[PDB]
Amino acid sequence: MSEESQAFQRQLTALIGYDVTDVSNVHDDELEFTRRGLVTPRMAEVASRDPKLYAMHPWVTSKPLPEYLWKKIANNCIFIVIHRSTTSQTIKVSPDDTPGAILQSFFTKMAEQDFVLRVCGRDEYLVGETPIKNFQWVRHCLKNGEEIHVVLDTPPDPALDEVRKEECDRKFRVKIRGIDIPVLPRNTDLTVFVEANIQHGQQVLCQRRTSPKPFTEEVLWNVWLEFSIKIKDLPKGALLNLQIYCLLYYVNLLLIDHRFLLRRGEYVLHMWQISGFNADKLTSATNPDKENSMSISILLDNHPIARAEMPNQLRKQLEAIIATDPLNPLTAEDKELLWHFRYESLKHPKAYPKLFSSVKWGQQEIVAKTYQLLARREVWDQSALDVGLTMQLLDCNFSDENVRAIAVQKLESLEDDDVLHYLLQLVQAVKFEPYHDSALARFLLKRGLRNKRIGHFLFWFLRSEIAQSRHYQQRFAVILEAYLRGCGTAMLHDFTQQVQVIEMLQKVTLDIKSLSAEKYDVSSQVISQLKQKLENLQNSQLPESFRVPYDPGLKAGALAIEKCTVMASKKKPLWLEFKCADPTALSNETIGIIFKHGDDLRQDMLILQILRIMESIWETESLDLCLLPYGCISTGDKIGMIEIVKDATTIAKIQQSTVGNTGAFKDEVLNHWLKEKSPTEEKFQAAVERFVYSCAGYCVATFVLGIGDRHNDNIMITETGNLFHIDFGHIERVPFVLTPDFLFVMGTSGKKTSPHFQKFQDICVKAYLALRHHTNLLIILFSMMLMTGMPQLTSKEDIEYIRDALTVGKNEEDAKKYFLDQIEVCRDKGWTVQFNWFLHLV
Ligand SMILES: CC(C)(O)C1CCN(Cc2ccc3nc(-c4cccc5n[nH]cc45)nc(N4CCOCC4)c3n2)CC1
């Protein structure tokens, strides 16, 4: 390539956090052929997008305005303020009006048509043929009782988005030669054997074993392991999972390559070790640690793919199977029904994952029948998109490329609004794809190229994985590189400014944590050399400003060094404040960010995403539970940034403020705090109403996810009454925190039913039922969260909680009770669970 084409790739590598052009950790050319493979879908999408709409990235929606927002417009008129520096005029607008209509009306109501309505303070433009009700920033102000401040400026130059130019009937067998490890020390002498499995989607097709020998650094066999499954019967996506028990080590090898050719030849595969099932266990990647890892030597030498109506009772049986939740196992009898009646099953889109779980993937004849069955997709295509359903077909239980492609097919109809909701979860599912190039990877690749907000989050999501996943970093980096070669030069510049800032902060953050000790503590010296380092950074060359990674409409400017400190936690996070880099911002207020090391913010990212999903469900049913899923982005390896919620305090501090003696908790204290932080009596009532809704929402959401038993410490509250949970980094009993300080705000001092307390029970039930109409979605979002989020879990046991919690297979009146009962446990326990929480530690 060109010299400047090489300067460009090293730019990409720094942005990616991994060198894709590197070839040290490969035993074929899947990754290279995938970089090549993704050139086309990147270029099709870059060619097709409107430059103007892409430059301005209008954030918008087709969902109807929820009821609670229609009661806020009882005049059928919405007010907009249009600013210019020396002046600004308010305009009454119809909810159906297009931004152009109001621009055209702003020239008339005065007493050259090349300007745009941008939001004051944010990189957010109101443009294109959509009614202003449909703009998400309009609905944001209508919900939180704010004004719609806008400024008439110049449309941004699409020139800045420039994309730089482009240039057998035999049975299967494997020969195990041996395993070698440099240093083996663990425990007194044990035995060691290899287990070879033919896998397709978490089903083992066939399994063989070696004879066990004593565990020492070299151990040979030279055995030919003869499987009963034939070569022709082998399906695309099939793995050869090789395992060492004494389970210590594992490695995998695809048996059909990306060119549909059977795998042949010699391979020495470096293997991953187990921590003293999960998505990592499926990876075609080999351990990059060639010096200290265990390896396996193997040999292949063996292309492929070259009327009647159902009776009444059996239909009842079938339909019953289809009705069961995703976590319900299928009997051999169950699977046989589903397959035999496959044409009737096909008529029910909710049967698809069960149906596709009844397929003998290890019989060519049956997979062909399955492909034939899939060609008459009339029912599936016409079905209304069910994100839950679609997700199930993307998990670890489906390796088939065509079964997964129908899933991605349905996704194509998601609007940007919705893709943003499931982006992270979708990114995590790439991990279940047998091959690097996949329908789904192309989908994320093209949806992000199409819209800058999806592109921005796509960037950070893929970049969190690359940084802390040797198992999938190579796959994910090939994809990030594909995206970055299409996003345009503004964004590359924008990402650079962002990466530079987090790298620069990463170094400060780590030295302070290390100079820092735990309990003690802080420590003036530490907080003084924090301000020293930061003043060193500003000049120079920390970026003049950068887009805020968890909120890319926001430009953070230079730091307010005096407002920056080191937090009072044993893990030493940096409380940073930045000046807003938009001078046309209507508020002087600073951008506050907590930069943390070395927790892993992936779990929080995930949880926060589910929470935003729950809010979106409630929005349909016209409910607003006042959740605060603040910004949280994993930026690198154990390094990430967190949005600071303005005027928020910890529930524990509000209790400690009264003399702070460990565990002595007083009921009246929270209501005392709120009333004190209230500018009027009016604002106090609003805070109580804000608390009743928020507390209600966190109660429901936190219970379903089984993260309800929390310390007072990780529950926070804004001075405006907004309660919100924090810190899922870590992950007697209580279902959720509903303590007597909370019940006193609502006006209850132990078994007394007040009007606010009645409200809480009401909203809870409404909120809990609304969630249950999405049981299948939640279950699947949660099953996936565990497999791609946590190091080792039970694919059986660990998930069930949510089945119980969601009250699967129970009528709405049993569910009303079931939750109202959980409320009574909270009131029964009182302060007891909170008391033990702080007690056991010292
Ligand atoms: C005075 C002093 C010592 O500087 C502080 C005292 C405490 N106070 C409130 C406080 C205390 C601890 C906090 N931990 C977190 C946090 C820590 C670890 C993992 C987390 N995942 N998600 C949030 C996490 N997040 C906070 N949020 C975020 C929301 O917006 C307000 C600050 C936060 N906030 C700030 C000033």
Curated annotation (Swiss-Prot):
Residues 706-714 are annotated as: Catalytic loop. It comes from the Eukaryota. Changing residue 710 to P: Abolishes protein and lipid kinase activity. Does not abolish interaction with GRK2. GO terms for biological process: adaptive immune response; angiogenesis; cell migration; cellular response to cAMP; dendritic cell chemotaxis; endocytosis; G protein-coupled receptor signaling pathway; hepatocyte apoptotic process. Residues 75-154 form the PI3K-RBD domain. The keyword DNA-binding does not apply. Pathway: Phospholipid metabolism; phosphatidylinositol phosphate biosynthesis. Pancreas, skeletal muscle, liver and heart. GO terms for cellular component: cytoplasm; cytosol; membrane; phosphatidylinositol 3-kinase complex, class IA; phosphatidylinositol 3-kinase complex, class IB; plasma membrane. Residues 307-486 form the PIK helical domain. ATP binds at residues 592-601, 627-635, 724-731. Its EC number is 2.7.1.137, 2.7.1.153, 2.7.1.154, 2.7.11.1. One of its GO terms (molecular function) is 1-phosphatidylinositol-4,5-bisphosphate 3-kinase activity. InterPro entries: ARM-type_fold, C2_domain_sf, Kinase-like_dom_sf, PI3/4_kinase_cat_dom, PI3/4_kinase_cat_sf, PI3/4_kinase_CS, PI3K-type_C2_dom, PI3K_ABD. Keywords: Angiogenesis, ATP-binding, Cell membrane, Chemotaxis, Cytoplasm, Disease variant, Endocytosis, Immunity, Inflammatory response, Kinase, Lipid metabolism, Membrane, Nucleotide-binding, Phosphoprotein, Serine/threonine-protein kinase, Transferase. CDD domains: C2_PI3K_class_I_gamma (cd08399), PI3Ka_I (cd00872), PI3Kc_IB_gamma (cd00894). Activated by both the alpha and the beta-gamma G proteins following stimulation of G protein-coupled receptors (GPCRs). Activation by GPCRs is assisted by the regulatory subunits (PIK3R5 or PIK3R6) leading to the translocation from the cytosol to the plasma membrane and to kinase activation. Inhibited by AS-604850 and AS-605240. It catalyses: a 1,2-diacyl-sn-glycero-3-phospho-(1D-myo-inositol) + ATP = a 1,2-diacyl-sn-glycero-3-phospho-(1D-myo-inositol-3-phosphate) + ADP + H(+); a 1,2-diacyl-sn-glycero-3-phospho-(1D-myo-inositol-4,5-bisphosphate) + ATP = a 1,2-diacyl-sn-glycero-3-phospho-(1D-myo-inositol-3,4,5-trisphosphate) + ADP + H(+); a 1,2-diacyl-sn-glycero-3-phospho-(1D-myo-inositol 4-phosphate) + ATP = a 1,2-diacyl-sn-glycero-3-phospho-(1D-myo-inositol-3,4-bisphosphate) + ADP + H(+); L-seryl-[protein] + ATP = O-phospho-L-seryl-[protein] + ADP + H(+). It holds the Pfam family PI3K_C2. The keyword Lipid metabolism applies. Heterodimer of a catalytic subunit PIK3CG and a PIK3R5 or PIK3R6 regulatory subunit. Interacts with GRK2 through the PIK helical domain. Interaction with GRK2 is required for targeting to agonist-occupied receptor. Interacts with PDE3B; regulates PDE3B activity and thereby cAMP levels in cells. Interacts with TPM2. Interacts with EPHA8; regulates integrin-mediated cell adhesion to substrate. Interacts with HRAS; the interaction is required for membrane recruitment and beta-gamma G protein dimer-dependent activation of the PI3K gamma complex PIK3CG:PIK3R6. Phosphoinositide-3-kinase (PI3K) that phosphorylates PtdIns(4,5)P2 (Phosphatidylinositol 4,5-bisphosphate) to generate phosphatidylinositol 3,4,5-trisphosphate (PIP3). PIP3 plays a key role by recruiting PH domain-containing proteins to the membrane, including AKT1 and PDPK1, activating signaling cascades involved in cell growth, survival, proliferation, motility and morphology. Links G-protein coupled receptor activation to PIP3 production. Involved in immune, inflammatory and allergic responses. Modulates leukocyte chemotaxis to inflammatory sites and in response to chemoattractant agents. Candidate target in therapy for inflammatory diseases. Selective inhibitors and protein ablation are anti-inflammatory in multiple disease models such as asthma, rheumatoid arthritis, allergy, systemic lupus erythematosus, airway inflammation, lung injury and pancreatitis. This is Phosphatidylinositol 4,5-bisphosphate 3-kinase catalytic subunit gamma isoform.
